[PDB]
Amino acid sequence: PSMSITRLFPALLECFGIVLCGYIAGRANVITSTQAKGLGNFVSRFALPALLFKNMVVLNFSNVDWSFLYSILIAKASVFFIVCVLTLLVASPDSRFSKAGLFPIFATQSNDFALGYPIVEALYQTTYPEYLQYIYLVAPISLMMLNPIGFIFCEIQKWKDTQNASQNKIKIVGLGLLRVLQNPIVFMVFIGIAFNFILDRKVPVYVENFLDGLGNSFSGSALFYLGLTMVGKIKRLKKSAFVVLILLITAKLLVLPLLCREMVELLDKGDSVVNHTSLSNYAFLYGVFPVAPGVAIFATQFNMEVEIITSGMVISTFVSAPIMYVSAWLLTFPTMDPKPLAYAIQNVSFDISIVSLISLIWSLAILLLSKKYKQLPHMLTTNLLIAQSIVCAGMMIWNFVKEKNFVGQILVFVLLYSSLYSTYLWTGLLAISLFLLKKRERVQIPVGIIIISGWGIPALLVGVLLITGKHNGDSIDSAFFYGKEQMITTAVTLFCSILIAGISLMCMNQTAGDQQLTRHVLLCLLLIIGLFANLSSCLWWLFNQEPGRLYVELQFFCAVFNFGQGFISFGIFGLDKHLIILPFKR
Template structure:
């Protein structure tokens, strides 16, 4: 056409004459905004009145993210007329974004605390340069420029992915550098971090769909094939209404407040976005067009550049910026330390478990009575809506799984990560964290908020870079409280949308809890499950077992110079000596002090042939069976006055006798078990018992044929450990070797020790050998503190009772955490790899049933800072969710919600 040209936009041939058309159509802006907010209002009403269920809302979010937006991107990339693109506009916008990005990044590095400045710099810089391009930007631009410049909408589909590939990798690299620095993972080079980030960004679904669309543009000649076009048009045209309606759903119950302390960050970032961006975009375009003969046609494009700069920032981004005024905590939790468990590569669905209940409508949550009163404050949490809502999120996982598989087919990345932020004024439940333990998907529900302390330092996941696309999370309201890193690291499924699909659940929607899905199970341990575990003292007669028991427990069990002085087992509790416990008691000066205890059993001596009943052997072996670990006592001292049942002292021979008796007893036990299983599983055809039969055959081969103890084999899998724990064989029990020396030999540390150590290393590698002297310990125990110190200095030796007690406790796979306050300092015994709710259940079952969060301090941090308040100020007081694995020595304050009691009839 003369004076104009055809532009193909959204499947339509539109005549475009820039010289005669008006700059923009302001008259169409108000109807467009009315249409947008009308649809949003409809979604809000539907969600608020329960017309839309949680499952239906989630399905809508999945449809928008997995179908509508990908189709919209694909169609516009195929139909894009590259010849008509004014590239100076793109460069001006990108240069403006780079300037703002760099400014925010540098300022953050200058003013942020050293411990978290890299992560903050990367995240804040990303936030200050993002725009709500698709959800709200598209209808505004379309309304203003449809009649004059219909091609302007195409710039939205170019700026977004280019910005994503240009700026976001820098921010994500800074986040990864923060993790790398705080985790001290120097085995991973910085170059490797950069390459991983770039790979993840290139695999981002928005970039992927743009690339596919551009390739298709050249393959199809700028037109989508007719049949494919009809299908794609149907999906793409549904995006606008569906996305806006879904935005309304996400707004239900999300009206909150931004506190004064968090408002500073929000104001700074909004200023950078709304003031600098539009001015820079406009000025850069005019600068690039200076001297260009065609620049006279770019007046409206200059105005458009200014308009693009003021496009609203994603409200969810603003909320994150307002809440993220705390120290960035990053680390790793796959090995149980937190996070970050090594909270590394993550895959799966993301589900939101958020509560927006109001303080005035619910009672206070309970807390551990021994907590220091300095915590203060009343913690608000609703039992009817909030606690039930915590469990409800899993009921919709099946819908999500299908969408994730589909997203994978579309080229979505499957590794994501996220971490929690703080939520002002009220307790809020955040989105769940997803952790992968050796390719096993799990869900981590992170619950956090503390009303009395302004600083909150949640652990962050290992991978922070995953998928912060340009506007996928841009439709949340400014008061939507969610996990901050969920904005960055959602799966490929949700990186495709202009929403945050995991945010649609509303606090008034209740669904029955789904069993399972409480995150990764800890690795199984061989042995009885529980905390009231016992360790038995086992050995030949007259090797010093009862003497050791008396010294250890400070009791007066019979210890005589004849075999079988002990018939019935003696049992006692031994407090675990711990400087940490003593420090807490000295600091708090509590009314009650309760340390952890080791349960020790003195078992009568075994003799050769005990498995066949010699010397009351069957009874004594049954006493060993009731124990969970073994102190294997062997005699290495010469004393003519003390009888040795074998005639002479030979500790290696004595060890072999005890080992063989335990193995022979297991051999006797294995035979009938296999015979019974063979009768039912093999001849009877019981398929359920066939795996157990196969495992028992493997155990028989190891114990009977190869004549080895069960614990010697370190490659038992989970199923095999289940069978071992069913029968609790004697040879599966952990064993610590105690070598009882004379006082003279103990001081010299020479006699027999080398031979014993060589035997243990050859037959029971990894087992602990501890030399001690019953005579020395007895004498040492009766001395005063001054005499003990003088005697030890003169003889250059120390008591090893503390070492024996601690290692015996560790052999039982036990550890403990502390609750500390002016009322009580107490060590609570738990199994290793116990999660926070189960640890809380040790205090009271209601703590586990109504678990909200665990506020955790490391003892080393508490001691270093000098007080709980100082630890909070230093960012070392963390709030952990239900999948936090408690570590030995943690100081914990539990928050819980009292479970609803059944009504009396």
């Protein structure tokens, strides 16, 4: 495999578990403000400098592959230059240099030590341990090369408020470099190389043990402090600020990873094709790291646009987790034999379901604690969320009995795909429900027969599939548990669902309690996109049975939607707890 992709998911939970635990502790006021700074300064003053000093003093510069460095640095520099120039050309002159300083830093600075290292470590503990030393020397070098340019830009903006015709050019440059030296990670690296020759790579045993204690305490503490500070940082920004965050996070998580792997392609000679492929994959994964929390600190120190910088830092942190997981799996696929590749899709489907079900259980708790499920549309959403819960629960059961006794397989397959067809069908039925409510008529909106049709019809389709279908116990994938008839049944279920959902949403436009039409319509539109992917996948297979082309990436994303849709309904209904039940639960 050369990546150890199976250990990625446990690492991501452990890393974002501490962040979530910190956020929960901060929200519940378990940790006071005075303890927050006590933990905050310890990480920045003791845990981090000890970690940085420990690695660089024993680092062997003789065996360092500097080719990977220049590829990452130029990729970072290219993103820095692109963002800086673009934000200079079309930003308002009053706050043009402040944006030109922090925004390129935002799109290039990454959380390599606190969060990047555990994912990099878990993937490359054994296959490529030399990849671990890169992250400790890529990050500080990047900070001393690009941040001075960004820091100088903020000094220009600061001195503009001071007026005085923007003089003291040497002072503006001087303060820019000075702030970089004052950064703990910059000078403690310089001390690391300093002691790398003075003390030599060998270090006293008692010193080494002391540095291990503080060093191993950084990642856990920094991640906990990360989520601790997230409390009350996301504000309802304007549309212009909302669009900018889309572009800035895209530059960090999409443009930067693509540039990092393309520069490695031509910088790195790659005598071994296998080693070249691993380096290119690692370069892609390094680019998709969240914005470092230290960028938000720079905004507060400079008193510039903290709100957009802090919100982007927090959002990019959570957004990167799906991107890190999905991208790392898709990079492995071109080097998978079709049979182990089948296990790869099942492995992704399994662990997406377990995180999705937790979101669905919370979403059901929010929706059923109140009397929302009494209401006409939210009753329809409740049925859809129950269907999604069984689909996620069915995949967990299916994973353990996919290669076991026949009687066990047939019960789980009925359980899994009767609910899966319901989620396809509930998308259309929910869209019909929105049409009736939007039409605003005296009609009684017969939810009684809707619920029967929502669950009964998928049961009939499964029953028809069983009496007319060919069993495959060898089939690892549940989509091919039956023959082409299952794809015909799946395509028919998807096909009819799209029209009834598509037409109903269209009729709402022609037509134009506490029912959220905008939230429900958004949910239906997002679900339909997943129906397009699944319908395309089924039609592609029927015309061409042979896989291997972009089908394999299409199959991966289809499996992501079928069991990840719960996350799509928790983003909408799970998150917005507000006070609809907060007094109720209190």
